[PDB]
Amino acid sequence: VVGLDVGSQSCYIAVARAGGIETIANEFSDRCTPSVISFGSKNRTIGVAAKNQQITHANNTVSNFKRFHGRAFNDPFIQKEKENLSYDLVPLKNGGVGIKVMYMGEEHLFSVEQITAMLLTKLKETAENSLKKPVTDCVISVPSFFTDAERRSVLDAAQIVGLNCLRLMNDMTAVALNYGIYKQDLPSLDEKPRIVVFVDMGHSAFQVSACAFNKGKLKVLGTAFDPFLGGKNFDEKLVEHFCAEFKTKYKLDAKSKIRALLRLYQECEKLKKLMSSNSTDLPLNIECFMNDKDVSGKMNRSQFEELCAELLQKIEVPLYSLLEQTHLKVEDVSAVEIVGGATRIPAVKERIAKFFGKDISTTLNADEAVARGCALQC
Numbered sequence: 001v002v003g004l005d006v007g008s009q010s011c012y013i014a015v016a017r018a019g020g021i022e023t024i025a026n027e028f029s030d031r032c033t034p035s036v037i038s039f040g041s042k043n044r045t046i047g048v049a050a051k052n053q054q055i056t057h058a059n060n061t062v063s064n065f066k067r068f069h070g071r072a073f074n075d076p077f078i079q080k081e082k083e084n085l086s087y088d089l090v091p092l093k094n095g096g097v098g099i100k101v102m103y104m105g106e107e108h109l110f111s112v113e114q115i116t117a118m119l120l121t122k123l124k125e126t127a128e129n130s131l132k133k134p135v136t137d138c139v140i141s142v143p144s145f146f147t148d149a150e151r152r153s154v155l156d157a158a159q160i161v162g163l164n165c166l167r168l169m170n171d172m173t174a175v176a177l178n179y180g181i182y183k184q185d186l187p188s189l190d191e192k193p194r195i196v197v198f199v200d201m202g203h204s205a206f207q208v209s210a211c212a213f214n215k216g217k218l219k220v221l222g223t224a225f226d227p228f229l230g231g232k233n234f235d236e237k238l239v240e241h242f243c244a245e246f247k248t249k250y251k252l253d254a255k256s257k258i259r260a261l262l263r264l265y266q267e268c269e270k271l272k273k274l275m276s277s278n279s280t281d282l283p284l285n286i287e288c289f290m291n292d293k294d295v296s297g298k299m300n301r302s303q304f305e306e307l308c309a310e311l312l313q314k315i316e317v318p319l320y321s322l323l324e325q326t327h328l329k330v331e332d333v334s335a336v337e338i339v340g341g342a343t344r345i346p347a348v349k350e351r352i353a354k355f356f357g358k359d360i361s362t363t364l365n366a367d368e369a370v371a372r373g374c375a376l377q378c
């Protein structure tokens, strides 16, 4: 049974092997498969070869589509999202979200179920190349805020592939189960349960849960979330900043050309990630940005944090929500464990730590924890 963490930006694959849980590496020997599909004239590509083409083939490269599951085109959520995409979003005949691209010489209209199914197919093939056997049974991750329609949409995708999804697993339940199996020296059943808070901020959302653990027993006490706050919001802030800085210094409007704006998003995200390990002034350099002009600017962590002041304030809100629901007090919590790509942002970690009055723990592998939990389920 393969565990599949299908993220809006990246995917991971895990499976129970002899002894424990292993992540499965792909044809680039990587655990991480970008959630990106590129449609060419002779074929299509999925993963990093698609992602590497995202500027060159921007109109026919599809990404960040996970949050379209179970959504109507007319939803203000989708109307907003639509504006930032390099590819065409149109309504399907049933009102759902349609993805229009040029493919095998012809115009194609895809549902999100169909797009996700193309991604699932690659992951399935990846697992089969490593295990040297057919893969059918799987567990697929879903955010803990996904509604029943959004979940059914993901199941519909898996059925298109011919996968037998035994279970859609809540990301935070994935993480909890992972912890519950791997954490050493949990309390005995005859001891006071250990209350752990899990925080997962990915590209598109912020999720938090509280769980009580004993050896062989897990109880989820509550979950909270901001489905509209993730790593990408921070990218957006940097992009808006440099877009204006470049209008001033170079009189170039990045917003006017989509492939320049995309490239600006790429650079700002790279910059964001680097500021997690480097606090000094860091270069942003984009060769031949537009009108053959090279552009340049700089940024450091402290300035990034000031720019993202309002976003960082939003971090404590789901934490407050969690306590409100569970009636837990921070002193009840033994540890705060982080997982996911964007929780690593030092200002985000700091806000969490200050809220619970505890240092942040990193017992689990932040990138792999969800897939590993999915692989544990069955």
Ligand SMILES: Nc1ncnc2c1ncn2[C@@H]1O[C@H](COP(=O)(O)OP(=O)(O)OP(=O)(O)O)[C@@H](O)[C@H]1O
Binding pocket: 006, 007, 008, 009, 010, 011, 066, 201, 202, 203, 204, 205, 230, 231, 232, 269, 272, 273, 274, 276, 340, 341, 342, 343, 344, 345
């Ligand atoms: N070291 C780092 N510092 C800061 N941000 C990072 C770092 N590594 C990854 N990120 C950010 O984390 C996000 C990706 O997180 P993750 O892989 O958990 O998302 P996902 O699971 O694909 O998406 P979603 O949770 O929205 O489905 C991106 O915004 C990325 O820029």
Ligand SMILES: [Mg+2]
Binding pocket: 006, 007, 008, 171, 202, 203, 340
């Ligand atoms: Mg995720």
Ligand SMILES: [Mg+2]
Binding pocket: 178, 364, 365, 366, 368, 369, 372
């Ligand atoms: Mg792990």
